[PDB]
C-alpha cells in the first residue's frame, strides 16, 4: 500500500521550519506511514491550499505566519483555547470539515506537567504577544489560580488580563514593565513569553532574579539557544527550568495526537531539533 | 539546510497499488535531491480543488492516473503536443503558475525503444486499441514512423486510432481485424503488445503466429509485472531484440521529472527499485 496518511504545513516563508524533521523522525520512530509536507504558501494561495489538503485527503495540517488569523475564515469548527486566543495554528481535518486548535501555548503546557500541575497556580508571564496570550489561555482553562502579565505596552498586558478575567475560572492582572521587578514570594511559575533571548546567549528579560527561588518553576519559550540567559540565572538559583525546545517539540506531539489520535515520542523529536539546532 | 524540499505527486483513485512514488522517490534520494512525490488518494468530487491545491502549495508538477487523465484538461492552460492528439494527461507541469499538461504513456516505450532503435521512417505494428495503444501510436507518429499497424479484437477501436494517425498526423495508419492467430505483416520493423494480455500472468501470450517474426524485428511489451511475459521470452528465444514494460515504467518516471526539474534521474536506480517491489 502505497498511499501513506498525509499532514502537513502552511507559512511563508517555510525553510526555516524544521517541524518537518522532527515530526518525521517521530513517525519513523512509531513506525507510523505518514507524511508531514512543508508547504511555501502565500497569502493569496492560502484559500486554494486549505482547498488542496481537503482534496487530497490530509488530516491536517499546522498554520504559521502569516495565516494563524487568516485561517479562521476557512474553519467548520474551532476549539475554545483556540477561539480565546484569537488564532489558529493547528487545523484537523476530520469527516471533510476543518477544526481550528492552537497549540501555542498547549506545547508549554506539556512541557509544564512533566514538573507540576498548573491547577491553583501563581502565575508570572512576561510578554503579551501570541505566545503570552496563548500561553496565558491555556494555564487558566487547565486551572490556574493568578495570572500576571507583565509588558512594556501595558495596553497589551491589559488585553490578556481582561480575556482570562472575562472567559476563564483564573483571575487575570496587568502590570506596566518598567525596569527589574521583583516578583510575588508566592510565584509558582515563572515564564518567559518574550522574544528577549532569540538567537541569543547573553540578553536576560529585566527582572530581580533574587526576587526568585528554587520554589518557582521558570519556563522560557525560545527555542533557540534552548538554555538562555533566562534559564541559565535561573538554574543556577536552584530552579527548575523548562525550554522552548521542549515545548516546540511538544507542539509536534500535540498536533499529531489532534490529527491521527497517536502519540509520538518526545525524546525521539527533541534529538531531531537538538542535532538541528546544534 | 534547509526544510523546503521541492514539491511532486500524484493525483489518482485508488492510490495504494501505484509504486511511482518508491521510485521516483529512490532516484530523488539518489541524485541528492530534496524533492518528494506525494501520492494523493483525490476522487473525482475533489479534481479541480486538487489541481488548484497544487499550484497554492507551490508544487513544480504532479502526475494524474485513472480516473483524472481526461477530466483534468479542463483545469489546464496549455498542453503538449502529444498530450493534445491523445485527448488525455498524466503529467503535468506547474511553471510559474502556468499548468501545461504532458502525456507520457507513450513516451516510456519511445525511450525504451530509441535504446535500440530509430521510430523514425519504421513499419509498426501494435496489438491493442485501448489507452495504451493510441499513447503508443501516436508518440511513434510524431517521432517519425512512416507505418502504424493496429490490431484489435474489435476492429472498430482499431480504426478509430488508425484514422487518428491518418488524419491528424504525418504518419500513415492502418486497422486490422484480430482474427485467431496473428501474423506479422511482411517488412513490419517493430511489433509492440498494447493489450492487457499477461498482467501479472507469465503465462498468457498474444495469439500471434510468432514464426512471422524475424530476428531482426524489435519486439516489446507495455506489460510492467511480469517484466518477462510469456510473449518476449518467445520472441527472445526466436533471437528477437525486446523491451520490456518495466523498462517503460521507468522511462516514464524519468522522462516526468526532466518535465518537472530539468533534471535526469539514474534510470537503474528506479529499475531495481521497481525490480524489488515487482518481485512480491
Ligand atoms: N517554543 C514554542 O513552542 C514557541 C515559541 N515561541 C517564541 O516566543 C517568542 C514570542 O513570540 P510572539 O508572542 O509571536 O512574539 P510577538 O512579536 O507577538 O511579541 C513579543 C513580545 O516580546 C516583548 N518584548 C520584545 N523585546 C522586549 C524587551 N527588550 N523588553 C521587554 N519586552 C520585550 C514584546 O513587548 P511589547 O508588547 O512591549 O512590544 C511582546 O510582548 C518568539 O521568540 C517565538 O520564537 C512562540 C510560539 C511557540
Ligand atoms: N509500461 C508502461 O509504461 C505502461 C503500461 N500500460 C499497461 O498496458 C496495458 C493496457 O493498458 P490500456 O490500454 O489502458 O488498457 P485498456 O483497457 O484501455 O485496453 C485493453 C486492450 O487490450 C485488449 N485485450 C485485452 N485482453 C485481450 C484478449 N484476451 N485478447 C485480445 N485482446 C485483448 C483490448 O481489446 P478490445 O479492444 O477488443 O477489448 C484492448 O485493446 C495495461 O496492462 C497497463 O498496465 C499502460 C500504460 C503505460
Request: hydrophobic share 45%; proline share 4%; glycine share 10%.
Amino acid at each position: 500500500g502505497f498511499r501513506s496518511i498525509l499532514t502537513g504545513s502552511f507559512s511563508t516563508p517555510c525553510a526555516d521550519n524544521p517541524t518537518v524533521a522532527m515530526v518525521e523522525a517521530g513517525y519513523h520512530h512509531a513506525g507510523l506511514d505518514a507524511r508531514y509536507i512543508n508547504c511555501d504558501v502565500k497569502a493569496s494561495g492560502l484559500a486554494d491550499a486549505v482547498k488542496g489538503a481537503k482534496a487530497m485527503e490530509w488530516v491536517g495540517f499546522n498554520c504559521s505566519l502569516p495565516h494563524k488569523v487568516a485561517v479562521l475564515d476557512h474553519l467548520d469548527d474551532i476549539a475554545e483555547s483556540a477561539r480565546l486566543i484569537g488564532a489558529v495554528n493547528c487545523v484537523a481535518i476530520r469527516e471533510g470539515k476543518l477544526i481550528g486548535h492552537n497549540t501555542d501555548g498547549k506545547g508549554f503546557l506539556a512541557s509544564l506537567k512533566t514538573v507540576t500541575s498548573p491547577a491553583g497556580k501563581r502565575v508570572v508571564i512576561l510578554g503579551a504577544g501570541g505566545a503570552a496570550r496563548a500561553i496565558a489561555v491555556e494555564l487558566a482553562l487547565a486551572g490556574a489560580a493568578h495570572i500576571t502579565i507583565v509588558n512594556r505596552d501595558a495596553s497589551k498586558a491589559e488585553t490578556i488580563a481582561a480575556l482570562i478575567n472575562d472567559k476563564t475560572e483564573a483571575t487575570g492582572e496587568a502590570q506596566a514593565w518598567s525596569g527589574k521587578f521583583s516578583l510575588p514570594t508566592g510565584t509558582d511559575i515563572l515564564i518567559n513569553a518574550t522574544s528577549i533571548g532569540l538567537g541569543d546567549p547573553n540578553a536576560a528579560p529585566p527582572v530581580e532574579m533574587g526576587s526568585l527561588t528554587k520554589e518557582t518553576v521558570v519556563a522560557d519559550v525560545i527555542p533557540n539557544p534552548p538554555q538562555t540567559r533566562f534559564l541559565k540565572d535561573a538554574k543556577a538559583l536552584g530552579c527548575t527550568t523548562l525550554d522552548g525546545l521542549g515545548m516546540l517539540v511538544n507542539q509536534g506531539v500535540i498536533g499529531v495526537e489532534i490529527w491521527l489520535g497517536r502519540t509520538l515520542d518526545s525524546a525521539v523529536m527533541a534529538q531531531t531539533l537538538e542535532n538541528i539546532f546544534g
